[PDB]
Structure 1
Amino acid sequence: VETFAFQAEIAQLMSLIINTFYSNKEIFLRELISNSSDALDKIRYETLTDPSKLDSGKELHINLIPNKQDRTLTIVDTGIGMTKADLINNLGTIAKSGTKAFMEALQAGADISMIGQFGVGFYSAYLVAEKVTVITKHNDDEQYAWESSAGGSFTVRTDTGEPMGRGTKVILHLKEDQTEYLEERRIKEIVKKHSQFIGYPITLFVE
């Protein structure tokens, strides 16, 4: 297990997400599904010129898996995935510059729900999660698990035993008071409200 420090601006963005009073928490799901869609577009685009990019899985989809017993909500996609280097470099985002633009925007009237416009929507997972695990497999690398309970650091390790083939899985270990996000009717409402036109099938698993 390797332990990394978040760059200062990311640590500050995370602290802001965790500590700012902001009721409209549900937007985290739209931001994660939007990230899954972008990654799925990327593998789709690569496959248009190289069909073999799909040998690791032809199906392009997003699954939402709540688990009341573990208190987790997991989002799985069969997108391009990330290499170990992408994971370390802020989950493939331009987080340092994005965070600055997000800050400047906040001071100009913007609210937390606009996070995705600054390329750092991933971090909105911390509105509802005490811990986030990102398991990912890209065609050019092995399967890795990134993890962070915030606090200024994240870990990266090799992941084994449940190979995914290709894609990203985001496991949200929910805060005690945010279990509404495990409820079928609540998830469906949020998907319908914010993710109605996503170009990939979104399957909500039942328990």
Structure 2
Amino acid sequence: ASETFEFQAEITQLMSLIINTVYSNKEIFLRELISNASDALDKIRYKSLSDPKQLETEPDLFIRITPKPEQKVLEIRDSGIGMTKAELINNLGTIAKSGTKAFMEALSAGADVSMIGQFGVGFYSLFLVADRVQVISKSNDDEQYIWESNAGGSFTVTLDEVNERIGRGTILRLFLKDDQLEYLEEKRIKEVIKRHSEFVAYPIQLVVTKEVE
């Protein structure tokens, strides 16, 4: 089933750096998780210009945020390109990432955290509001996998026998810090999106559970 890989040294420093941080601008994680969604959607859209058969596994292009208050979990789904087992391992590295050293040094010097995106390590910004993450992904080239991290020195990758089938794409499952549950509220999620994710090519769905009036 499961399988452990160790994070490259500097990437651990970075996660540690982020998770033990104050900063009112924590909301920017959502900005970043939505960029990645858009970038992954861009890729599959483009990819299928030369290969229409490629969109077939999940026709519609969307981003969809689901709060799950019941279990202090916020999920950001896309129908983007997705990531294979190999891609999960190399890219949620394992492999040394260029902006990483460059950014922490940037941080120490006075840099704002929202810069994280401009250093190409934006994904790790999620640890501002989460201490567990599941990246479940399903790429056309491969089976659905779960990548898990608690922000330690190593992460796990399991074949996904457990959550639902993404036609294609990726769900970010965030297990939220107890002080950061505001990101489960509709009003709040709506506020962050409207301020940061203003210019986005794809639809942004928000799943909301109403008890019957």
Same fold (TM over 0.5): yes
Distance in 2 (CA, whole Å) between partners of 1:186 and 1:94 is: 35
Residue 177 of structure 1 corresponds to 179
Aligned residue pair count: 207
CA positional deviation for 1:205:
0.9
Question: What residue identity is the alignment partner of 1:35?
Answer: N
**TM-score, scaled relative to structure 1:** 0.95
Q: Is the 8 A contact 1:94 1:120 kept in 2?
A: no
Residue 100 of structure 2 corresponds to 99
Distance in 1 (CA, whole Å) between partners of 2:182 and 2:151 is: 22
Residue 193 of structure 1 corresponds to 195
1:50 equivalent to 2:51? Answer yes
Q: Could you give the per-residue CA deviations for residues 159-178 of structure 1, whole angstroms, max 9, x where no partner exists?
A: 02521110000000001111
Residue 75 of structure 1 corresponds to 76
CA positional deviation for 1:204:
1.0
CA positional deviation for 1:94:
7.5
Q: Is the 8 A contact 2:7 2:93 kept in 1?
A: no
**TM-score, scaled relative to structure 2:** 0.93
Identical-pair percentage: 70
Distance in 1 (CA, whole Å) between partners of 2:181 and 2:79 is: 26
Task: Assess, with a 3 A threshold, how the Cα gap between structure 1 residues 204 and 172 changes in structure 2: closer, same or farther.
Answer: same
Structure 1 residue runs without a partner (length 5+): none
CA positional deviation for 1:107:
4.3
Task: Assess, with a 3 A threshold, how the Cα gap between structure 1 residues 164 and 92 changes in structure 2: closer, same or farther.
Answer: farther
Q: Is the 8 A contact 2:5 2:94 kept in 1?
A: no
Distance in 1 (CA, whole Å) between partners of 2:200 and 2:122 is: 16
Residue 138 of structure 1 corresponds to 139
Distance in 1 (CA, whole Å) between partners of 2:208 and 2:93 is: 31
Q: Is the 8 A contact 2:41 2:80 kept in 1?
A: yes
Helix, strand or coil: the match of 2:22? coil
Helix, strand or coil: the match of 1:76? strand
Task: Assess, with a 3 A threshold, how the Cα gap between structure 1 residues 92 and 205 changes in structure 2: closer, same or farther.
Answer: farther
Structure 2 residue runs without a partner (length 5+): none
Backbone CA RMSD of aligned residues: 1.6
Q: Is the 8 A contact 1:93 1:120 kept in 2?
A: no
Distance in 2 (CA, whole Å) between partners of 1:83 and 1:154 is: 16
